[PDB]
Amino acid sequence: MEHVAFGSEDIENTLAKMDDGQLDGLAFGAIQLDGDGNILQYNAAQGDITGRDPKQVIGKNFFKDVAPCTDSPEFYGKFKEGVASGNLNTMFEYTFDYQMTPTKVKVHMKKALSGDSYWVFVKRV
Ligand SMILES: *C(=O)/C=C\c1ccc(O)cc1
Structure with a gap:
């Protein structure tokens, strides 16, 4: 799977290289929204x-x-x-x-690196 930690400091840089297929290998929920x-x-x-x-x-x-x-x-x-x-x-x-x-x-919300996109990351507590 993809080894990316929830709430990581440089998560927007790492997830910039992930296609839809790669995103599906994350340990946590990930949504990308437009503005x-x-x-x-x-x-x-x-x-x-x-x-x-x-x-x-x-x-x-x-x-x-x-x-x-x-x-x-x-x-x-x-x-x-x-x-x-x-x-x-x-x-x-x-x-x-x-x-x-x-x-x-x-829930962790964070602006993506590029354009007008935003991340919503979710894990159980
Ligand atoms: C309330 O409606 C909260 C969250 C939520 C997240 C993802 C999906 O698909 C539905 C609802």
Whole structure:
């Protein structure tokens, strides 16, 4: 598998070399969003945690369609600020409970290296 540690300092540089196939070899869930919150990448580990079929969610809006429970100042509010500020690095716990068993996770959001893309990393706690 891919040996990348959750919350690593240079994770945006390392994941810059990973294709969709490589992302699926991570020890934790990984989502790539555009500045509007549309889903660009969604790896296997994330799909194990949420039950979503990765291919099926790419293209939908994370905050509108897929994960309305994140539509809150505590999640989406922080996202919208990072995008507007052009910088984002934050780590917090949250509960995912839409159409699923309530699951506690640690979330790390961080701006990608290139363009207008942002990472959302998730692991169980
Ligand atoms: C609330 O809706 C939280 C999270 C979440 C994450 C991924 C997917 O697919 C659904 C929901």
